Every structure is written in structure tokens, then in C-alpha cells.
């Protein structure tokens, strides 16, 4: 039996009945800020409320538009509690603030109007650095860059990264505007140049993205890359690739070159329903990306990857959390050609499988007996020249493959051992990592005395402990791992750390 003042909403209460907070939450979906419920039950919805104005405090650097455009409750319209509550999640997913506090205040001049107030404290966003080196052996070396997610508080994401040295020079410039249109359409792109002394390349790309739902968005765009190779050391996989394109490198002769100009199309799909931008406790994220060639390009291929992660709390306080991380990917050729070798997938390092040296997981190079030369004494890989061997030379020099899968499980725990001014920036986890990288089109029948790189079952495994700390200079991650499953040619590195901003 429901009694009291039900302002035209009697069915809704019978429906929720067949509670203590659901009647209030229900009325909160309409402009009823302060109803009363007593208990069969007698309620009083009260008066309909309107929002007189929305004001902010504590945004000393970010542009006001940055926050106002994220609200779903509009001024001069009736209040809803869900319409306001979504503002906290929307601001938190930006990653710009330490916290979002909210309130509702009564207007002294009338019982039926309120002010809605959001109060935030701005966090450090990115960093600028550079460095130098000189000397009798170092010669001249210089590197520099800057990266920020919120440039001068204006909402643009920018960065510049590059270096100059005696063997390799490069630079990359990237800019993007999450808001080109008032509805959330984003634009952006980058330019890069990378000349490594021989692998010289450069290129550019531009993309567009736009939301299609409250939690989902799409991306697509265009780009171009130039690739100029020379002085390529003979390898079986490299020559297989070259042969597939009509090239005929001379046997055991590194005096060679090849270049292409390739235009491609980019696309992707993103789902993001996370609660927080740093140490999320709920939600999941799915990032599906890929690109295909445009007919008329020198290369013909496609590449697709998928990155996922899920956070699930197992308590009431959101302190004990289970995090699953998975990545898959595959690419291939079109038109009868193989996928270019410089697009191969790699794994190993803090971004994939812990405890292995970067880009060491997977197939290794097999070298031809290169023509004997003046580098045979002590300047080369002995069996890679005629001076050391007359047959196919095995190595531990990882070259990567055409497909991979990596996964881990991390059990996230609090570390209530240090003062809050530190503890709120530190979280730790126990982890188990595994992954595999493998090839296709591997003629293991022709190479019967050599490893068969087509067998994906050779899964590499490790586990260990990691700590993440949101340092004021940029998040850092430190860890130690012990490998359990390793194969011939693998190299371990148990003490590792890197920048924690991915």
C-alpha cells in the first residue's frame, strides 16, 4: 500500500515495489530534489526544481569551456540527479584532475531553485625536457621533446619528440583537437622523419574521429609513408619478402637497396566506459585499430590489432581489484606479396610481457654465409659470413613475426604503508604474464634442421611483482619478474622499470 503525495507517478512506485533508496532515486530522475519517504509507505515528492546557474571553482589553468562542454545538465532546465551525476564520470575520464567534488545549494530567494557546483584541483599534465652529450668518443649527441595532454589548459593534445646524433636522426610532431565541432568531432595527425644509419623513412598521417553513442566512438583517416632501405644484411626472411615482390638480391652480397612510396587508409573503433583515468576500479576498455593499403601503392597489405583491459572490484570499498589485460593482432599481404618485414609484431618489455628484453619474444634471424670480407676477424657474426660457415646460420637476433597474442593477469592491492600524500599515488600488483609471437608462410619442410616458427604453442611465461606510482613528474612503473617458461634464444631481464604513462 503506497500513500502520500505521488505527483502523477503512482505506477513507477508500484513497479519498483514489485526500495528505501529506489523511490528517492526514481524521483531524482525528475525535478524532485528533496522528497520524503516514510514506512505501507507514504511519500511526498515536493516541488519541481530548476537549475539557475552552474559555476566552477579551482580551474585556475584549464579553459572554462573545457569543463562546461562536458556537462549534460543544461542551465535553465529542470534538474535530474542522473543528469548531474554523469558529470563526475565525464570529467574523470579526461584525466585532467585530482578529484571531482560536487554539491547542490538552495537559492535563498526561492525554495524551488538550486545552484550546482563542481570543484576540482588541476593536476600536472605532461612534461618538457631535453639533453646533450659530448666527448672524444661520444662526439655530439642531442635529444629533446615535450609532450602534453592539455596544452596551456586549452584542451589540445600536442607533442614534439626528436634527436640528432652520428648514426640516427629523427623527429615526430603530433597535434590533435578532441573538439573541432561543438558535438565532439576530433581531428589530428602527425609528421615524422627517421633516418637510421641503413633504414631511412618518413611519413605523415591525418585522422578524424567522432562519437556514435555515449560510450563508443569511431576513427578513420589517411596517411603516407616513404621507405628507403640499403646495406641490408642477407637474411632468409628478408630475401623471401624481397623475392615475393620480384626482387633478386645477389647471394651473400649486402651491397643492395630498395625503396617504396606507400599510401594507406587508417581506421579504428573504441569503447571506453572506465570510471577513472589513472587507477580505475570498474569498467572496461576495448581499442580495435587497423589499416589497409590503397590500390596503386607499392605494398599491398592489411594490419589489425586489438587491445583490451578489464577492471573488476571484489570488495565494497573498491580497494581490492582484479585486472585482466589482453592483446591480439594479425596482419597479412594482399595481391600475392608478403607483409613488409618492418611491420612485424614484437613483444617483450614492460608494455607486453615482463621479464624479457624488449622485442626478443618470437622468431629469430637466420643468416646466409655472406661473402668473406675484412670484417671477418672480429667485426661480424662469425657464421654469417663465408669465413665462419658455409650453411644457414642460426642466431638469437629477434626479427619479429606476423601474428601475436599477449595476456596477463594482475591482482591489484593497496599498500597502506606510507602517508596518504604518497599512498594516493601508489598502487601495487602481483602479476602473471604470458605471450607468443609467431610467423606464417614458414617453410619448415625446406628447413627441417631449424626451428619451426609456425608452431604457436611455444608460449613464453613469467610472473612477478610490480608497483605503479603517479609521480608528479609523470607516472613511473618499477617491477621485477622471474621467467618460468623460456625457449632457446630467449634473453631475460628481471629488474625493469619504465615510464608509467602509456
Amino acid at each position: 500500500e503506497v500513500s502520500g503525495n505521488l505527483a502523477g507517478h503512482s505506477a513507477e512506485i508500484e513497479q519498483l515495489t514489485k526500495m528505501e533508496d529506489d523511490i528517492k532515486k526514481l524521483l531524482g530522475r525528475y525535478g524532485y530534489a528533496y522528497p520524503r519517504v516514510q514506512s505501507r509507505v507514504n511519500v511526498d515528492a515536493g516541488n519541481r526544481f530548476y537549475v539557475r546557474k552552474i559555476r566552477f571553482e579551482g580551474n585556475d589553468t584549464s579553459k572554462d569551456a573545457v569543463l562546461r562542454r562536458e556537462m549534460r545538465q543544461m542551465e535553465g532546465a529542470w534538474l535530474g540527479s542522473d543528469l548531474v551525476d554523469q558529470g563526475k564520470e565525464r570529467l574523470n575520464r579526461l584525466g585532467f584532475f585530482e578529484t571531482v567534488d560536487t554539491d547542490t545549494q538552495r537559492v535563498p530567494g526561492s525554495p524551488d531553485q538550486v545552484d550546482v557546483v563542481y570543484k576540482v584541483k588541476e593536476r600536472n599534465t605532461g612534461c618538457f625536457n631535453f639533453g646533450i652529450g659530448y666527448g672524444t668518443e661520444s662526439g655530439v649527441s642531442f635529444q629533446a621533446g615535450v609532450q602534453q595532454d592539455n596544452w596551456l589548459g586549452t584542451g589540445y593534445a600536442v607533442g614534439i619528440n626528436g634527436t640528432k646524433n652520428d648514426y640516427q636522426t629523427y623527429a615526430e610532431l603530433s597535434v590533435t583537437n578532441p573538439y573541432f565541432t561543438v558535438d565532439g568531432v576530433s581531428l589530428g595527425g602527425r609528421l615524422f622523419y627517421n633516418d637510421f644509419q641503413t633504414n631511412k623513412s618518413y611519413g605523415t598521417d591525418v585522422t578524424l574521429g567522432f562519437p556514435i553513442n555515449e560510450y563508443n566512438s569511431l576513427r578513420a583517416g589517411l596517411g603516407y609513408v616513404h621507405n628507403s632501405l640499403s646495406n641490408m644484411q642477407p637474411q632468409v626472411a628478408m630475401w623471401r619478402y624481397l623475392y615475393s615482390m620480384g626482387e633478386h638480391p645477389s647471394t651473400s652480397d649486402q651491397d643492395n637497396s630498395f625503396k617504396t612510396d606507400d599510401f594507406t587508409f587508417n581506421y579504428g573503433w573504441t569503447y571506453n566506459k572506465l570510471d577513472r583515468g589513472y587507477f580505475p576500479t570498474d569498467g572496461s576498455r576495448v581499442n580495435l585499430t587497423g589499416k589497409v593499403t590503397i590500390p596503386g601503392s607499392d605494398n599491398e597489405y592489411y594490419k589489425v590489432t586489438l587491445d583490451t583491459a578489464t577492471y573488476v572490484p571484489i570488495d565494497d570499498d573498491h580497494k581490492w581489484v582484479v585486472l585482466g589485460r589482453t592483446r591480439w593482432g594479425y596482419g597479412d599481404g594482399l595481391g600475392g606479396k608478403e607483409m613488409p618485414f618492418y611491420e612485424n609484431f614484437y613483444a617483450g618489455g614492460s608494455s607486453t610481457v615482463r621479464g624479457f628484453q624488449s622485442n626478443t619474444i618470437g622468431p629469430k634471424a637466420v643468416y646466409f654465409p655472406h661473402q668473406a670480407s675484412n670484417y671477418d676477424p672480429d667485426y661480424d657474426y662469425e657464421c654469417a659470413t663465408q669465413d665462419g660457415a658455409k650453411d644457414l646460420c642460426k642466431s638469437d637476433d629477434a626479427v619479429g613475426g606476423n601474428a601475436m597474442a599477449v595476456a596477463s593477469l594482475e591482482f591489484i592491492t593497496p599498500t597502506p604503508f606510507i602517508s596518504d600524500k604518497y599512498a594516493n599515488s601508489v598502487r601495487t600488483s602481483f602479476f602473471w604474464d604470458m605471450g607468443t609471437v609467431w610467423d606464417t608462410n614458414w617453410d619448415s619442410s625446406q628447413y627441417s634442421g631449424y626451428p619451426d616458427y609456425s608452431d604457436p604453442s611455444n608460449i613464453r611465461m613469467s610472473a612477478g611483482i610490480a608497483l605503479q606510482w603517479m609521480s608528479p613528474l609523470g607516472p613511473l612503473v618499477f617491477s621485477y619478474a622471474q621467467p618460468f617458461k623460456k625457449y632457446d634464444g630467449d634473453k631475460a631481464e628481471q629488474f625493469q622499470f619504465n615510464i608509467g604513462k602509456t
Binding site: 549534460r72 565532439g184 568531432v185 562519437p211
Partner: protein, 89 residues
């Protein structure tokens, strides 16, 4: 592009229903009307004693619906006239 990009619903103005609009009569005081309907969100700031009640809804992937009332009062706070625009022209 403009045909598929998601846009959230936009609400503006006072919330009206015929059940309550039909209750207003000439001769009611400003306090009686404000009580029955709620505080106006718009008025003439330039010396005319009148209130504007605007009900506006612009849902996503939809046109705009709007209904308005105008309430004209004299210098004594007595309602003198009511206008009604049930739909946009």
C-alpha cells in the same frame, strides 16, 4: 557527417502540462500563479510587468518542439492577459 554524429538531448525552460496550465485564470495574483506553476525563468527586464514560460525540447536525431505561455500583469500584480503558442510556427 551531421546526420550520424551523436548529440545528447537538450532541454530548456519551464516544464508545462495542460493539467496545470488549464488552472490559470485572469484575476489570480502573481503569488497564486507562481505557486501553481513555479517561479518564471524569463521576464521582461525593461519595465514591462510580464512573465514568459517557455517549454523547449530538442531531442537527439529529432526536430525541436516548443510550447510557450505569456502572462501579462498590471502595476498591481494582477494578471491581465494570457497568450499561448502551442507549437512553433
Amino acid at each position: 557527417l551531421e546526420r550520424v554524429v551523436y548529440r545528447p538531448d537538450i532541454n530548456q525552460g519551464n516544464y508545462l502540462t495542460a493539467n496545470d496550465v488549464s488552472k490559470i485564470r485572469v484575476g489570480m495574483t502573481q503569488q497564486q500563479v507562481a505557486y501553481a506553476l513555479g517561479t518564471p525563468l524569463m521576464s521582461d527586464p525593461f519595465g514591462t510587468n510580464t512573465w514568459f514560460y517557455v517549454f523547449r525540447q530538442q531531442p537527439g536525431h529529432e526536430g525541436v518542439t516548443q510550447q510557450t505561455l505569456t502572462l501579462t500583469f498590471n502595476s498591481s500584480g494582477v494578471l491581465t492577459n494570457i497568450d499561448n503558442k502551442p507549437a512553433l510556427s
